[PDB]
Design a protein around this ligand. Structure first.
Ligand SMILES: O=c1ccn([C@@H]2O[C@H](COP(=O)(O)OP(=O)(O)O)[C@@H](O)[C@H]2O)c(=O)[nH]1
Ligand SMILES: [Mn+2]
Length: 277
């Protein structure tokens, strides 16, 4: 019967925002107790999934590095299933997996625009959640293939609904975020409102919750297609709309998804994942 204080120490990081008004922890390096959590979740025999898509040139450029790194840093000490959606299985890189890692590969149709490739994920993930994932995992993360694990990315990140603070905006003012601002779009957020700017290529929660994230995001993607319109940052735009209405029970610091082009500020203590360079 886990308490927040059993594992979370917000005062270890006083220079940053460690909790939200709706009372969700923003998880920053130095704030979490991975050993206590590891013991608690292992006792419950939890299983964590991870979807990743790679279509076209993204297979040779990104997938090996994503999977190789995931194997060594993702939920170590816990059964993890990699869900790999590719258009061409014959180019799939062949990697040795360590203990408590397994996977299964699916063939997908390769969408024509790369914008649709990225946006179809929302449909595809939800179909998989219904078909199998709901039966297989207790928690699930969905991620861009053009990222790499740099260090441990563990059970401290688990919750009902998990969002990623986007690296370029965590410090910024809500009136400056790159939200979709055209009212003609489903992703629309008015000025004056919004809590954080979240990342498109990293989110998670229970299968139940991720089905809701994806279903609502794609409903708004479909609706935008029917008004001759396309959100600024596509699926990330709809994800931000969605998280404004349905607040995430957990937010991850930019340490969990850093862009090195920004440099390295004093805030970013130990990078767990960054963008492939
Ligand atoms: O040709 C493509 C285009 C996109 N993607 C997938 O769609 C995601 C989102 O695209 P991208 O990373 O290019 O978004 P960006 O990070 O540039 O905003 C990628 O991470 C891939 O998983 C892909 O596999 N092949
Ligand atoms: Mn990406």
């Amino acid at each position: 019967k886990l308490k927040l204080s059993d594992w979370f120490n917000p005062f270890k990081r006083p220079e940053v925002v460690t909790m939200t008004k709706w009372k969700a922890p923003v998880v920053w390096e130095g704030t979490y107790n991975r050993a206590v959590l590891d013991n608690y979740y292992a006792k419950q025999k939890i299983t964590v999934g991870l979807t990743v898509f790679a279509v076209g040139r993204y297979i040779e450029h990104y997938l090996e590095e994503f999977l190789t790194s995931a194997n060594k840093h993702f939920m170590v000490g816990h059964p993890v299933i990699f869900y790999i959606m590719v258009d061409d299985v014959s180019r799939m890189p062949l990697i040795e997996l360590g203990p408590l890692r397994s996977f299964k590969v699916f063939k997908i149709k390769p969408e024509k625009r790369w914008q649709d490739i990225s946006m179809m994920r929302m449909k595809t993930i939800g179909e998989h959640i219904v078909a199998h994932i709901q039966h297989e995992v207790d928690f699930l993360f969905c991620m861009d293939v053009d990222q790499v694990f740099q260090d441990k990315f563990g059970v401290e990140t688990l919750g009902e609904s998990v969002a990623q603070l986007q690296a370029w905006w965590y410090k910024a003012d809500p009136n400056d975020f790159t939200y979709e601002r055209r009212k003609e779009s489903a992703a629309y957020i008015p000025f004056g409102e919004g809590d954080f700017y979240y990342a498109g290529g990293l989110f998670g929660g229970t299968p139940t919750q991720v089905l809701n994230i994806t279903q609502e995001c794609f409903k708004g993607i479909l609706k935008d297609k029917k008004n001759d319109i396309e959100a600024q940052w596509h699926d990330e735009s709809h994800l931000n709309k969605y998280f404004l209405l349905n607040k995430p029970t957990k937010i991850l610091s930019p340490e969990y998804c850093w862009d090195y082009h920004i440099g390295l500020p004093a805030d970013i203590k130990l990078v767990k994942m960054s963008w492939q360079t």
